[model samples]
Target: RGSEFEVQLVQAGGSLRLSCAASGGTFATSPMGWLRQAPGKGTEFVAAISPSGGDRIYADSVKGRFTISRDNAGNFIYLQMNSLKPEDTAVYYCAVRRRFDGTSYYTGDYDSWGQGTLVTVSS
Candidate 1:
């Protein structure tokens, strides 16, 4: 029910990584992933790992560089970004995928979020 993430800094050509885990609850059905928020505006969906560990889905915009997945044990979640750039700088947050209604329109709602780790890209 609680988590903490530290700020991160990477070079323009470096990579980025974020992790998520919890001490309680059943994470088998609740997908886990990360969302990027820039300038405090509308946050952008990055990617999420299916509860069944069947698929690791990602946003089309960053499909090439962003990859999200979880461990086989289904205890931890991971988000990785390769070939980073300055534009990747943002407030990255790890979340537990909550409230997904397939019959509805969008499935972009998260109930739990980390304190948010600012990833500053510098070169």
Candidate 2:
């Protein structure tokens, strides 16, 4: 446990858009990273962001299907998953990784959490 709170997100596509809020008397200046965990498996690093208002970021190895966005109005952020597939099913989480000494990064370990929205797409 890094920060002392929970967060929420709205589903945008096959993936859930996790909204991480700054809490516990802490101001999050670090980049927000999203992770996906499959049952009985380790966490998969999905994406990270040095987010500002209305900006988006994607992980290096991922293709065009994943995206990140945010609304500064309510201090909310989002993630969109397109072209839904069966394997895409997993729990999505948003977290902040703080950069210490401007050299390395530290995983904040999901300071917040969303109730988790699940999407099952089929034709």
Candidate 3:
């Protein structure tokens, strides 16, 4: 992984933000997505954002409260959640969608994943 991840904790109704920044290697301009895995539960897709043109797509469960974005100049991607709740507590991951043969044939899957950040929401 060519990025750095962090775990952030905040109180309920507060904001939770996680950032993934390219620290080394050639950063790809592909779809970067986030995943959430609750304690003792499997992972769930959260949202994704394109670095090339800044298009964001989110899961229905997180559609309104989550915002995904990218900073080309900073070589980083951002995931922000507002009005956090206890249910929002989970391990957050940053991943880049993988492509095959170095062509347009995307696998619709994450190729590289950053170490997850466990975000805890407490009041």
- Which numbered prediction scores highest in lDDT against the true structure? 3
What's the candidate order when arranged by decreasing TM-score? 1, 3, 2
Segments in model 1 whose C-alpha atoms lie over 4 Å from true places: 1-5, 101-107
Give the per-residue lDDT of model 1 (tens digit) for 4-111. Answer: 546788898788777877655457667777778877567877777777766677777678898877766667777888878887887787777667654111336664
Error of 2 at 23 (Å): 6.0
TM for every model, in the order presented, reads 0.80, 0.58, 0.77
lDDT of each: 0.72, 0.52, 0.73
The number of clashing residue pairs in model 3 is: 0
Residues 77-111, model 3: lDDT tens digits: 88889978898888888877776454222324665
lDDT of 2 by residue, 7-105 (tens): 223343444344555444233455566776656866666666554533344544345887776554435556766655665555666665544444212
The top-ranked prediction according to TM-score is 1
Candidate 3 overall lDDT versus native: 0.73
Comparing 2 with 3 on lDDT, the higher-scoring candidate is 3
